[PDB]
Design a protein around this ligand. Structure first.
Ligand SMILES: O=[N+]([O-])c1ccc(C2C[C@]3(ON2)O[C@H](CO)[C@@H](O)[C@H](O)[C@H]3O)cc1
Ligand SMILES: O=[N+]([O-])c1ccc(C2C[C@]3(ON2)O[C@H](CO)[C@@H](O)[C@H](O)[C@H]3O)cc1
Lengths: 810, 810
């Protein structure tokens, strides 16, 4: 049908059809008479998977022969989503499979909807890892993603009576065609035990053993025949485990629980033992794999020349003392040499400045679980603090501030401090965030080792986030400037010369309308909700957190409702306000915010006076597959975090690429987005970081705003009195109390400017032509936000490797 | 190489080679440069599996079109062993695959050794189910085996310091190529809850739900293109299970533990809740499947015309009240009609008379777990006892004896009584056993309903137990009488005309010598033990139990040793005595017997005066794959249970078919074996059942034998004094105490006749020609013991279906 989806050749279509029929018979053990849509999905998945294998084997043997420097990306989260369409896109198989399935009497888009998301992440951090894997393969880097194969990913969210309910995401129920179990490469991981000092160094003895079994998933690059590997470890009990008999076998579950479930906290630290076990499990298994592969190329001087380890936040921070453990205790290297190798091998990416998200492990936990690692951490701290003392003599408070060990009621290890000490590079994820790191939380470290500190602004893959989810936009762009931009997104700048092109303006607006129609149809089918497709689609989708200020959005929604009710016969630009996102199961306030949103919807959506002018919808079970549907349909992207709180954001970039305009604070990557597009083409409002600082120095008093803004006062009085909960008048008392007395994120302080800015959005939307011209200027300047740019920078500035767009032989 | 292994055609070999290479590439994702023997095994298994699929699909659609009466064989155990060779044998692919792998530079026999046993059974009962499945497919019956897919089968046995150690049999670690998961056919199973009485019958409410997910394994018939199904259920938690969050997900293990592990008890009842859950789990899921398939053919009058349910012992006995539950509570049938259908549908096979093996469930367990089933059981009992009272008026003691409810300290339900009441046929498993049932434990029931009671003497499949494990013998037989005997074992009678044939005598003896050489080589390679291949191979392999009297064998071994030590320079026929078998983990005496055997070996095997004249070896980890190796190599089969204790035995039949002579008591199928071969061709000794009864009436006094037999006295004095345990003098005190004071199985009573009989064995072995002629007379009369004969009898006399040897189209 469309050009960017590749060729549908007679030979290819014929071959795909026969392999589809082969798999249905031999693999699924079904015939066309009893086969269901799910059977058809699996037959298609196996058919496409077959095309990966040759490339996968030859890529990995190529790395063995050429022996390039290997990049190991360690993460506790990989939010991969669906794999079928992505694989077809990267292999240029989409049109061919579309034709083949059509000739078999099947609709491929229907089949694609059957696949479960691989939901092995919480949101932004996990999705970044996934975009990064795609870019690393596209840029021909010898890269390996390493993590945990959770049996249960992020929970499925159900909404019952306006409240979030959680259910287990049993994503492996029907099997995972994309993974290859590798039980032959199983590795032992040690826990507990004790340290024994001998004539020749320390020994870690009397340990409990858990086995780490790897599952490998292919990661295809964009049309370059490169297929890299994501290796995820699964926990297994040894066969003599606990070996009355029956209970011993049943107790194997205790060891195997390590890989059972993803912790569902977004930007929050929970110091549970099981989480620590997960973190060591991934690190210990991965490092053995790294060392084995290095030895199969004695001389560890060359280790940093052949190995780069990237720590995705502090979650895999134990890699630092684990590498030291292996080099000192097992390989018999002297401390100083081992440390030099470790520092040159490891690099650390920080993803947030929120204090509650920072990992600070109680010493007593590490003492019991990982006694040798604690000893190593103490020794690292002593040697590091000796360096600080030499550089800043007499500065005793600096010594306590910089220590890896924090004193108090319970002694803790600061994992961020550990990472900085043991890494040659430390980066933030957007320019403003990286600057905040050097100015505030890591100021002392920057002063000691300025060369260590870098910025690497986040990005998103244009394969998943344009070509896959928005083929219509990809096609109209390709019609004018060709296909090269898909792996070189800076080429979108060429679209600036089409901003006054009448045909292009029409096409851009047509594509958006088509996307909105499709999404309005999706909503009616799966959720029985009706929306006006001519209204402005106002979208805020992201995890529910106070810092992200879904509450500020709520206040605007109520303002709009109250203004309509005051002047019902006055014209207003119609809006569909969509808010979606999951709350962490133990985060009470986040769960109350979800309830508020649905409660507002219950009032607004059923008021006859409002009509079709305002609709408020909560998007249930927000996840990667849903993002692919809603983002192409959006007109307005809500990126309204308090300045200085969102390290980068990546959702923001997805909306920019897909033809939505942005309303946002000068926070995270929003700053760079506005810089790229021009401030005139962005709806910027509210306090800057400096303004938040001034308010903090003075003391934030919410009452002041309540007293001086009558429209704001009305809303608070409505919430308190039970206007949005008639049967339970005091339901939202916690929310009002927080807003009025202990709001860390200053919702009221940005209210007036936010409402004002929203009026300017509505004004522009009244002029379709000028709205679309501004959209074109956003799409055209979104190139910087490709994860190909991000990864090229990591490669050149941290890892010391050169990217390559050269094809491997097919 | 050999005829019975089929043709190796040019087209077939070429095709097998290319499909092997295809699977290695696309399925295993390996190339020849990094592939291991295990990879090669899996490539072969997938290649052979491909040949099953067409036949599997067309067999099942054939049953859908023809709608024959379906046979459902319910068992908690299916001891399948390895599948690769069996599949090749039944599909006539053995020589072709041998050639194809040879041309690829691989040894197929080496590859076959990689496959794990499917060890989902304890011994005889589980292996009977497996032989039965093979015969049902070979006889073209529409038969389905239903059970549980245990994650862990029978434990692997290790011997440490002469003691049994258990380890988990992680049989699924590398995956199971033979099963097909069918998550789409998952069914709910209910536990706990309460009974609610309404205007329209009882309702079972407030239940806990566990999901039953089926895995299907193909069961190929012998060269008839029939492929039946064994469906095994796996336990799964529902997704809202226990739905703080983390613990709820972790607690899913509680539901899923149902299918975790096989209870390792052979002939012993352990009244644990988890075992009851397993039994209901299989029954509830299976019955829903049966009813669904019946409805997809309202009128339950035809149910028994279309469905037969065979209960393999009392383990699936809950099928009776569960069928009643479904028919009465859910389908709204009247009690009397439902009962008529149930009785006509169900049949029960009893497998033992040992009191400790009989299932007697505490009422309080059933009350809590299955409250509705208990109510139904009570109602069945009341109506049954009303029938007894009408037939035998005033006989109050008969009423208490026959009741399904047993009174006492704890009230219990007798599951055997439940099965007899609710089945139209009740059978024992050998003529003597079936007679014992009518004369003793079920006398009252036989008197009430004589027509119900039948015999079905056990059998073994000649495919696995001759063609597969002993191709050399199969071939020399085929050379004379053709190939028809493999599916018509009665044809072996034709070999009686070759008993004086000098060429045949030589060939039979040659095949045995070759088998002995191969096994002697297997022992040295995998276990580093050296044996004389010219010695008589004296073998007792079976589960370790007091009734099987491994101890009597031990006494003879010591007698032989003591006689050698008394007269060292006197000639004796050299023996290798091999004893193998697993002990239940909680069975202390059985574990002590294993220790005794190894302790005797430690003394005998290292005495320089003995030389190579006597060797005592404990065969570690006895299992189906090991049986296939040792049975073809045996000269003497030890079947020495106390008369009236071994219901049938099946190991006995395997040895008979493979050219060993039998030393045995008149117990179980031994009686019929001797009847078939002629008593002159069997080494029969010891008490008959009537002799055991006489001794019981008089009182068994072991001291009498000790006092009157000096050779026996010596052995007891050696055991007591510490001759076989110098470092721990009193180690075997429990054994001596049991033998002397509380021996239920009268070891001493058969000692003299046993030793005498063994002398006659040694005498015959001195004359190779006459030994072999007697062997030929055993092989020639083993035909009755084919499970094809057994299944034909079940089909005609219980199930009301006719077997068929007709081919389905290929
Ligand atoms: O399980 N955690 O402890 C955890 C999860 C997710 C995060 C984050 C941090 C964050 O999103 N999720 O990383 C993204 C990728 O760099 C940024 O775009 C977000 O601004 C940041 O909040 C931090 C810690
Ligand atoms: O788990 N159980 O409760 C259980 C297991 C095995 C058995 C048996 C009974 C037995 O062997 N195993 O059945 C065979 C097949 O009919 C007979 O050949 C044996 O004589 C009998 O002991 C009974 C009960």
């Amino acid at each position: 049908q469309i050009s960017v989806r590749g060729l549908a050749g007679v030979e290819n279509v014929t071959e795909l059809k026969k392999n589809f029929n082969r798999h249905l018979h031999f693999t699924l053990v079904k015939d066309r008479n009893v086969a269901t849509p799910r059977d058809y999905y699996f037959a298609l998945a196996h058919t496409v998977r077959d095309h990966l294998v040759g490339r996968w084997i030859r890529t990995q043997q190529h790395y063995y022969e050429k022996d390039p420097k290997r990049i190991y990306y360690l993460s506790l989260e990989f939010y991969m989503g669906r794999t079928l369409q992505n694989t077809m896109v990267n292999l240029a198989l989409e049109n061919a499979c579309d034709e083949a399935t059509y000739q078999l009497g099947l609709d491929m888009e229907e089949l694609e909807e059957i696949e479960e998301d691989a939901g092995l992440g919480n949101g932004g951090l996990g999705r970044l890892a996934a975009c990064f894997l795609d870019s690393m393969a596209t840029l021909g880097l010898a890269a390996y993603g390493y993590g945990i194969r959770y049996e249960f990913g992020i929970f499925n969210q159900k909404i019952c009576g306006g409240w979030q309910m959680e259910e287990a995401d049993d994503w492996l129920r029907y099997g995972n065609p994309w993974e290859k179990a590798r039980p032959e490469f199983t590795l032992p991981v040690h826990f507990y035990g004790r340290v024994e000092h001998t004539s020749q160094g320390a020994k870690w003895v009397d340990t409990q053993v858990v086995l780490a079994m790897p599952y490998d998933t292919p990661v295809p690059g964009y049309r370059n025949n490169v297929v890299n590997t994501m290796r995820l470890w699964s926990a297994k009990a040894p066969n003599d485990f606990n070996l009355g008999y029956i209970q011993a076998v049943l107790d194997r579950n205790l060891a195997e629980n390590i890989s059972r479930v993803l912790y569902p906290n977004d930007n929050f630290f929970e110091g549970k033992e099981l989480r620590l076990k997960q973190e060591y499990f991934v690190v210990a298994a991965t490092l053995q794999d790294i060392i084995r592969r290095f030895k199969s190329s004695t001389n560890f001087d060359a280790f940093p020349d052949k190995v780069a380890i990237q720590l995705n936040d502090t979650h895999p921070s134990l890699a630092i003392p684990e590498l030291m453990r292996v080099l000192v205790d097992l390989e018999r290297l002297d401390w100083d040499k081992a440390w030099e190798v470790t520092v040159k091998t490891c690099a650390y990416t920080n993803h947030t400045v929120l204090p509650e998200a920072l990992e600070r492990w109680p010493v007593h936990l590490l003492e019991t679980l990982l006694p040798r690692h604690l000893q190593i951490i103490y020794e690292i701290n002593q040697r590091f603090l000796n360096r600080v003392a030499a550089a800043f003599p007499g500065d005793v408070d600096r010594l306590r501030r910089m220590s890896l060990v924090e004193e108090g009621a319970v002694k803790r290890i600061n994992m961020a401090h550990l990472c900085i000490a043991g890494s040659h590079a430390v980066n933030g994820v957007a320019r403003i965030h990286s600057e905040i790191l050097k100015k505030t939380i890591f100021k002392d470290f920057y002063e000691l080792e300025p060369h260590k500190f870098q910025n690497k602004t986040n990005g998103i893959t244009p394969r998943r986030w344009l070509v896959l989810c928005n083929p219509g936009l990809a096609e109209i762009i390709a019609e004018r400037i060709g296909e090269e931009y898909i792996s070189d997104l800076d080429q979108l700048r060429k679209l600036l010369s089409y901003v006054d092109d009448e045909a292009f303006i029409r096409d851009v607006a047509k594509v958006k309308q088509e996307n909105k129609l499709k999404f309005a149809a999706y909503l009616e089918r799966e959720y029985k909700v009706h929306i006006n497709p001519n209204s402005l689609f106002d979208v805020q989708v992201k995890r529910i957190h106070e810092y992200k200020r879904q509450l500020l959005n709520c206040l605007h929604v109520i303002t709009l409702y109250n203004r309509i009710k005051k002047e019902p016969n006055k014209f207003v630009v119609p809006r569909t306000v969509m808010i979606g996102g999951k709350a962490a199961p133990g985060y009470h306030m986040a769960k109350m915010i979800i309830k508020l949103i649905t409660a507002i919807g219950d009032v607004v959506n059923h008021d006859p006076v409002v009509g079709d002018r305002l609709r408020v919808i909560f998007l249930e079970n927000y996840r990667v597959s849903l993002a692919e549907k809603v983002i192409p349909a959006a007109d307005l992207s809500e990126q309204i975090s308090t300045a200085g709180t969102e390290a980068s954001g990546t959702g923001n970039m997805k909306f920019m690429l897909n033809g939505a305009l942005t309303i946002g604070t000068m926070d995270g990557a929003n700053v760079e987005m506005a810089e790229e597009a021009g401030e005139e083409n962005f709806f910027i409002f509210g306090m800057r970081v400096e303004d938040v600082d001034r308010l903090d120095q003075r003391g934030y008093n919410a009452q002041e705003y309540y007293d001086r803004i009558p429209e704001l006062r009305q809303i608070i009085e409505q919430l308190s009195s039970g206007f949005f909960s008639p049967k339970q008048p005091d339901l939202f008392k916690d929310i009002v109390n927080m807003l009025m007395h202990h709001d860390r994120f200053k919702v009221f302080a940005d209210y007036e400017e936010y409402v004002k800015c929203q009026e300017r959005v509505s004004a522009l939307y009244k002029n379709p032509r000028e709205w679309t011209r501004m959209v074109i200027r956003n799409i055209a300047t979104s190139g910087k936000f490709s994860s190909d740019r991000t990864i090229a920078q990591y490669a050149r500035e941290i890892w010391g490797v050169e990217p390559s767009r050269q094809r491997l032989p097919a």
